[PDB]
Amino acid sequence: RSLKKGPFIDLHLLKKVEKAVESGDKKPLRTWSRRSTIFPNMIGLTIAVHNGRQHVPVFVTDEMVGHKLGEFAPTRTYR
Amino acid sequence: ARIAGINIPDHKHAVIALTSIYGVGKTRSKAILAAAGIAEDVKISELSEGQIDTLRDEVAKFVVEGDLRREISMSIKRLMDLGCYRGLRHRRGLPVRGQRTKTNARTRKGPRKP
Amino acid sequence: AKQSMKAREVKRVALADKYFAKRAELKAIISDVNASDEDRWNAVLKLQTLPRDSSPSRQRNRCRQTGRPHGFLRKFGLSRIKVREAAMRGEIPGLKKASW
Amino acid sequence: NQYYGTGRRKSSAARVFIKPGNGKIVINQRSLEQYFGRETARMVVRQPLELVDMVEKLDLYITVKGGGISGQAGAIRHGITRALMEYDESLRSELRKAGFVTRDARQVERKKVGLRKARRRPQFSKR
Amino acid sequence: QRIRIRLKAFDHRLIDQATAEIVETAKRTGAQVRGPIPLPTRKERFTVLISPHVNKDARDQYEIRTHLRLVDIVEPTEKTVDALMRLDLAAGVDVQISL
Amino acid sequence: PRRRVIGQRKILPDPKFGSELLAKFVNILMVDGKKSTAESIVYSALETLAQRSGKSELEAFEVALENVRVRRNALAMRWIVEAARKRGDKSMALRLANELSDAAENK
RNA sequence: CGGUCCGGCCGGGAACUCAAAGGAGACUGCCAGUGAUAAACUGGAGGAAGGUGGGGAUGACGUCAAGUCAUCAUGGCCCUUACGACCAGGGCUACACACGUGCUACAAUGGCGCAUACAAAGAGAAGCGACCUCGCGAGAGCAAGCGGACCUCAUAAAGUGCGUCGUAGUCCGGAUUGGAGUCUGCAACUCGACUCCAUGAAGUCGGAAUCGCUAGUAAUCGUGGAUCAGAAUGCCACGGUG
Ligand SMILES: [Mg+2]
Ligand SMILES: [Mg+2]
Ligand SMILES: [Mg+2]
Ligand SMILES: [Mg+2]
Ligand SMILES: [Mg+2]
Ligand SMILES: [Mg+2]
Ligand SMILES: [Mg+2]
């Protein structure tokens, strides 16, 4: 989909990764970046992905690298 | 004539008979015949066994068999076992890449019933 | 449209010539340069900290007289109904009801 | 001595240059068989030269721009008839009888507002 | 050298009046002009809705006709240049000079 | 038609044979305005009828026309073309040639 | 006509096509017949056009308290540290179904491969973007020309010529899905376009019912434009065949 010249990630979420590596794992991190590409430095962390009204925590797995955080949060409730 | 693609191609022209193997369309069948040196309008008649096994080696680079069925399937199993949004689409039989679900979703949903 | 909606459109244009006219124009070129900085240009990351409302994709071409976002024409800069009211009073030069 | 006649169609335009004596046909620096792909288009230009007999009797140097298969062929057929009226001037009684001098002015009808075509209306519901 | 004047306007009966004033002045002062040529009219066509709501089929059919005139002057005579450059022409005529 | 009583148009005849009736025959088979592909099928069908199914090509079509009989000629040509489409042979020139062979021998 | 590097390309030619400013020309004008000697009709000649030539603009008094307080204008009412305003994300694109409106199909009047001929009308400067080079391709790099009858989009498609498939769920039809990518834009997950590989649903001409159309019309083939950063099976135009 996206062009190969640079995988996109937001600047605020990239700062949240850097403090999480140095200071160790924390409580699940609330964010709104559903468009960020998952990098290998995020494996192990729990990122709370906003889906319209709440934040759903997502435990990052090794094979999640390359996907988006929006691909793990359903935005509507179906019955 | 039994290829590594065990399912027997029909006794017709070469570029048509290679299409019956799962994973070889019209374009890839042209690439094998161009790399081997066999004309596309040559039938299974006069296609000698020295000309069939050189087609076995050219198709050997690509995995085109029931082994290709599981590699497409386990790629979907990577989605469904992960718990992603796209993995939820395959489990219920819903369209994935942006097709609407109001009407005209008959391929994904299956036949109609109220 | 509403007065607050037209105030949003003035706010986007005033930032469009401010930020993304010359600064993002350079950042679009350096990310596109194949000759130098093939790996670590980082112009995309500096574009992220810029404000969003300078974008030409976010602005909406609207009628200059009423503010309708529908039926715009770049020839007139107006909505489709307000083109008629200036045409029938002869306010637009050469514009007339045609037959062919 | 040149004898000239203008013939046209919907979007075609053809000139006709007459020179006395040959069976030569040069259309857009090409031959008659080379340019016209349709056999019907080869014969419709032969139709005005039917009552007036041509075998090897007059040159025609023709060019045409615009139109299509029968649009160019209809332009030449109109153009030949005005050249023969220029050539002999007594041939008109046979040419009015054939009807080839009449310019077919049936142009395309305009695409109307509210309809997808000139007369074709979008599909209608009773109630 | 060669100077040319591109004349363009909306009205056809108004563009030829200002065209005739330039050519007659140029012939009077002894200039060499190969007449005015009629360039093809670039006419725009506009179809917009007349209703603000449903009844889609009722529309208006507008046009904008842009006529074109070109006058070519061969010799740059000083009496020709000083007369034509500050003429009093119609307001609806735009001039384009190539020196 | 209630008030407007007018005639019917007279098209130009066949350029190959000079036949007015054969010009109306190619227009029935013609679909999507394809004159060039319609007349090539009709000419190849009649040449199969002429060379291998009886001489006098212009008369051989007439005997096939006579058994299935302005409107009388129009409905006769339409019944040949529409029945030729629903056959088992390979091409349209082969199917319509066998229909004119059957219409000549009234079966 | 001279000049050939075979290109109107360069001297030139102003004829012609085209380009657009003005004008002529069709008015039952003429002839014959019918008709109350009327209006009118029929037939024929002349003519490019003949009986309001072809098409458009042009839609009376009124009818439906038809549609529009969400184009706008506007009487009155209502809220006002909120029925206002800012921002992020989501929704407008959901899914057991129903209805209307379209596209592509179910094919040999076709499919595919190669060769190849003919359009009209528009768009273009924060734009159209050639040539050259690279990639199977979407494109990318380099880089002119052009505010334009000059340059660019832009090689029109059907058709034609040959070869192939031989009546089948097929070399029909392309849905759906996976994998790998292009481009637009802060940013393509929800929800973009396009390309490449692979997969090859239903469908073999469609019930009751129902629609369009009397001629360059129907049918069909492509092209262009508006909207638009990007996003046309819709809509507006334009021609080709007929
Ligand atoms: Mg295959
Ligand atoms: Mg207001
Ligand atoms: Mg927008
Ligand atoms: Mg009312
Ligand atoms: Mg009401
Ligand atoms: Mg297919
Ligand atoms: Mg009618």
| Assigned token pair, D58 | 């007059």
Report chain E residues whose CB lies below 8 A from the CB of C99.
61
Ligand 2 centre from C53 Cα, in Å? Answer: 24
Count Cβ atoms below 10 Å from residue F30 Cβ, excluding itself. 17
| Assigned token pair, A75 | 């935005």
Interatomic CA distance for residues B107 and A50, integer angstroms: 32
Task: Report the nucleotide nearest the CA of residue E11, measured to C1'.
Answer: G21
Instruction: Decide if D114 and E56 are in contact by the 8 Å CB cutoff.
Output: yes
Residue–nucleotide distance: C4 CA to G85 C1' (Å): 8
Boundaries of every domain in chain C: 1-90
| Assigned token pair, E74 | 């061969």
Residue–nucleotide distance: B29 CA to G159 C1' (Å): 31
Give every CB contact of residue A34 below 8 A, 6+ residues apart in sequence. Answer: A49, A50, A68, A69, A70, A73
Give every CB contact of residue B97 below 8 A, 6+ residues apart in sequence. Answer: none
- Please, which positions of strand G sit below 7 A from a protein CB? 15-22, 46-49, 53-58, 66-68, 70-72, 84-91, 93-102, 108-110, 117-120, 122-123, 126, 140-142, 148-149, 156-161, 164-167, 171, 175-179, 181-193, 196-201, 210-221, 226-230, 234-242
What values do phi and psi take at F77, rounded to 5? Answer: -75, -30
DSSP state of C65: S
Instruction: Decide if F36 and D40 are in contact by the 8 Å CB cutoff.
Output: yes
Cα torsion angle, E31, E34, E35, E37, sign: negative
CA distances from F13 to D13, D54, F16, F100 (A): 25, 21, 9, 21
A72 in contact with chain B, both atoms CB, cutoff 8 A = yes
Counting CB pairs under 8 A, whether chains A and B reach 3 or more, is: yes
Residues pairing with B28 in the sheet: none
Count Cβ atoms below 10 Å from residue C12 Cβ, excluding itself. 17
Counting CB pairs under 8 A, whether chains A and F reach 3 or more, is: no
Contacts 24+ apart (CB under 8 A), D90-94: D91/D52, D94/D51, D94/D52
Beta strands in D21-73 (DSSP E): 25-27, 58-65
**In chain A, what is the straight-line distance between the N-terminal and C-terminal CA atoms, in Å?**
32
Beta carbon of D123 within 7 Å of strand G? yes
Ligand 2 centre from C2 Cα, in Å? Answer: 6
Check residues 39 to 68 of chain F and report those whose beta carbon is under 7 Å from nucleic acid strand G.
Answer: 40-41
Buried b (16+ CB within 10 A) or exposed e, E20-51: eebbeebeeeebebeebeeeeeeeeebebbee
| Assigned token pair, C34 | 């194949």
Instruction: Decide if B85 and A74 are in contact by the 8 Å CB cutoff.
Output: yes
Interatomic CA distance for residues B99 and B83, integer angstroms: 21
B27 burial (CB, 10 Å; 0-12 / 13-18 / 19+) is exposed
Give every CB contact of residue E33 below 8 A, 6+ residues apart in sequence. Answer: E23, E26, E27, E71, E72, E73, E74
The resolution, in angstroms to one decimal, equals 5.2
**Three-state SS for F75?**
helix
What values do phi and psi take at B38, rounded to 5? Answer: -110, 135
Interatomic CA distance for residues A15 and C48, integer angstroms: 13
Beta strands in D30-78 (DSSP E): 58-65
What is the nearest CA distance from E57 to chain D, expressed in angstroms?
A: 5
Give every CB contact of residue B6 below 8 A, 6+ residues apart in sequence. Answer: B65
Cβ D104 vs Cβ D74: under 8 Å: yes
| Residue A76, CA atoms < 13 Å, CB-side half-sphere | 2
Tracing tokens 């096994």 back to the chain, one arrives at: B53
Residues pairing with D59 in the sheet: D19
- Which amino acid type is present at position E73? I
Distance, C-alpha D86 to centroid of its chain: 17
Count Cβ atoms below 10 Å from residue B39 Cβ, excluding itself. 10
Beta carbon of F87 within 7 Å of strand G? no
Q: Which among D99, D101, D62, D47 has a CA at the least distance from the CA of D78?
A: D101
Beta carbon of D77 within 7 Å of strand G? no
A47 in contact with chain B, both atoms CB, cutoff 8 A = no
Interatomic CA distance for residues E71 and B101, integer angstroms: 64
Residues pairing with A37 in the sheet: A68
Residues pairing with E63 in the sheet: C96, E45
DSSP state of F41: H
Q: Which among B86, B21, B99 has a CA at the least distance from the CA of B60?
A: B21
| Assigned token pair, B42 | 């040559």
Interatomic CA distance for residues A7 and A67, integer angstroms: 11
What values do phi and psi take at B81, rounded to 5? Answer: -75, -20
Cα torsion angle, E85, E86, E88, E93, sign: positive
| Assigned token pair, C30 | 């350096």
Interatomic CA distance for residues C63 and C70, integer angstroms: 8
Tracing tokens 């990577």 back to the chain, one arrives at: B78
How would you classify residue D21: left for phi > 0, otherwise alpha for psi between -120 and 50, otherwise beta?
Answer: left
**Three-state SS for E51?**
coil
At residue F82's C-alpha, the angle toward residues F81 and F84, to 5°, is 65
| Kind and range of the H or E run holding A50 | strand A46-50
3-state secondary structure labels for all residues of B1-14: CCCCCCCCCCCCEH
Cβ B67 vs Cβ B74: under 8 Å: no
Interatomic CA distance for residues D85 and D78, integer angstroms: 11
Q: Give residues preceding each break in chain F, C–N over 2.5 A.
A: 69
Looking only at the bridges linking them, the beta strands covering D13-20 and D7-8 are antiparallel
Instruction: Decide if F15 and D38 are in contact by the 8 Å CB cutoff.
Output: no
D45 burial (CB, 10 Å; 0-12 / 13-18 / 19+) is buried
- Which amino acid type is present at position D92? R
Count Cβ atoms below 10 Å from residue A10 Cβ, excluding itself. 18
Interatomic CA distance for residues F37 and F45, integer angstroms: 13
| Assigned token pair, E93 | 């005529």
Cβ D42 vs Cβ D6: under 8 Å: no
Count Cβ atoms below 10 Å from residue D100 Cβ, excluding itself. 21
At residue B107's C-alpha, the angle toward residues B105 and B110, to 5°, is 90
How would you classify residue A71: left for phi > 0, otherwise alpha for psi between -120 and 50, otherwise beta?
Answer: alpha
| Assigned token pair, F30 | 């013609």
Give every CB contact of residue B17 below 8 A, 6+ residues apart in sequence. Answer: B9, B10, B11, B44
Interatomic CA distance for residues D51 and D59, integer angstroms: 17
| Kind and range of the H or E run holding C15 | helix C3-16
Q: Which among A44, A48, A21 has a CA at the least distance from the CA of A32?
A: A48
Please report how the helices B85-92 and B66-82 are oriented relative to each other, as an axis angle in degrees rounded to 10.
Answer: 120
Instruction: Decide if B83 and A72 are in contact by the 8 Å CB cutoff.
Output: yes
DSSP string, chain B: ---SS-SPPPSSBHHHHGGGSTT--HHHHHHHHHHHT--TT-BSTT--HHHHHHHHHHHTTS--SHHHHHHHHHHHHHHHHHT-HHHHHHHHT---SS--SSS--HHHH-S---
Please report how the helices F57-67 and F35-51 are oriented relative to each other, as an axis angle in degrees rounded to 10.
Answer: 100
Instruction: Decide if B85 and A70 are in contact by the 8 Å CB cutoff.
Output: yes
**Three-state SS for F73?**
helix
| Assigned token pair, C7 | 């105030």
**In chain D, what is the straight-line distance between the N-terminal and C-terminal CA atoms, in Å?**
71
Instruction: Decide if D113 and E56 are in contact by the 8 Å CB cutoff.
Output: no
- Which amino acid type is present at position F63? V
